[PDB]
Amino acid sequence: MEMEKEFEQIDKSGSWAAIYQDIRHEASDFPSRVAKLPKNKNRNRYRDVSPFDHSRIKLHQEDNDYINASLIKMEEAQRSYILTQGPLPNTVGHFWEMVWEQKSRGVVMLNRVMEKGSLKCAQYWPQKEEKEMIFEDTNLKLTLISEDIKSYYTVRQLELENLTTQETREILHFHYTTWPDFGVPESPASFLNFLFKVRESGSLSPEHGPVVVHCSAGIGRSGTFCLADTCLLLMDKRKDPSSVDIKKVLLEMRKFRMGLIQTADQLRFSYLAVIEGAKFIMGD
Numbered sequence: 001m002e003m004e005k006e007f008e009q010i011d012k013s014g015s016w017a018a019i020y021q022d023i024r025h026e027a028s029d030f031p032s033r034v035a036k037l038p039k040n041k042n043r044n045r046y047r048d049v050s051p052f053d054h055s056r057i058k059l060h061q062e063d064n065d066y067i068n069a070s071l072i073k074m075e076e077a078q079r080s081y082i083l084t085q086g087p088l089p090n091t092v093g094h095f096w097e098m099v100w101e102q103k104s105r106g107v108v109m110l111n112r113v114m115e116k117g118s119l120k121c122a123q124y125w126p127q128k129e130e131k132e133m134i135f136e137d138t139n140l141k142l143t144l145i146s147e148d149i150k151s152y153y154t155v156r157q158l159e160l161e162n163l164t165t166q167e168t169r170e171i172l173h174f175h176y177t178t179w180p181d182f183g184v185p186e187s188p189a190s191f192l193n194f195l196f197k198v199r200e201s202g203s204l205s206p207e208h209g210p211v212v213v214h215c216s217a218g219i220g221r222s223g224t225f226c227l228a229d230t231c232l233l234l235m236d237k238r239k240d241p242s243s244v245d246i247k248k249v250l251l252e253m254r255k256f257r258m259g260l261i262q263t264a265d266q267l268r269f270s271y272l273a274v275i276e277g278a279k280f281i282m283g284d
């Protein structure tokens with residue numbers, strides 16, 4: 001069923017809450033035993049958001065390999081994503097260790113450091129060129145190279161140095177700065193413009209490790225970003241673009257991380273973004 005007609009049918013019937021609960025009911029349940037070990041309590045932002053054991057990213061160290069981060073591998077689309085929480089004061093070094101080890105080219109940030117008057121993640125990148133950051137626990141140096149501030153988003157060029165080997169890489173930081181404190185954006189136009197800037201950078205391409213994507217918990221806004229990207233890529237690849245089922249794609253992605261898409265409004269917004277984005281994919 002053409003999703004645009006499915007959309008109008010759910011809207012006219014006001015059944016978004018019903019569709020969303022059906023997804024919650026059918027979603028995978030896999031163990032998260034490593035996340036719940038007492039040694040890892042200060043590595044988790046939220047007690048109820050944990051990576052599954054089967055898909056969790058492992059840090060390359062014998063001491064403690066744990067980070068709250070999941071590998072989402074989309075086999076038919078040929079895209080992979082790492083979805084992670086906003087870094088905590090004691091996990092900023094782990095965060096950049098993961099970027100280095102997984103060979104990512106991009107970091108996508110969908111939250112502000114402060115929202116609703118509370119801290120949603122650590123200030124984990126440098127704000128001035130001449131004040132670099134050193135992460136003593138993981139032996140990394142991070143320098144701000146340049147910053148491009150736009151109306152809806154900011155792009156930063158960062159230099160990450162492995163102080164152990166003196167190798168350096170360029171990391172691109174894509175910061176969507178206008179998601180409202182409550183609800184979802186009224187139009188998906190600025191979110192789609194942002195998604196197309198990440199794509200144009202090379203950050204999502206198979207020559208690089210997987211993009212790192214985060215919000216505060218790494219399931220809600222973060223889920224919306226990867227769901228919209230994968231659905232549009234499948235509509236490009238297939239003979240029949242109308243065969244793309246957004247609900248089935250979301251349940252596939254929920255095999256790899258719990259709770260992706262946090263509200264019925266986020267589900268409706270994901271449909272809107274894919275429907276409006278397809279009017280480019282199909283030749284406009």
Ligand SMILES: CC(C)N1C[C@@H](O)c2ccccc2S1(=O)=O
Pocket residue numbers: 103104105169170171207208209
């Ligand atoms: C081997 C080539 C294709 N690269 C892939 C990846 O390892 C990476 C990650 C961050 C910055 C640069 C690079 S890369 O251009 O050296």
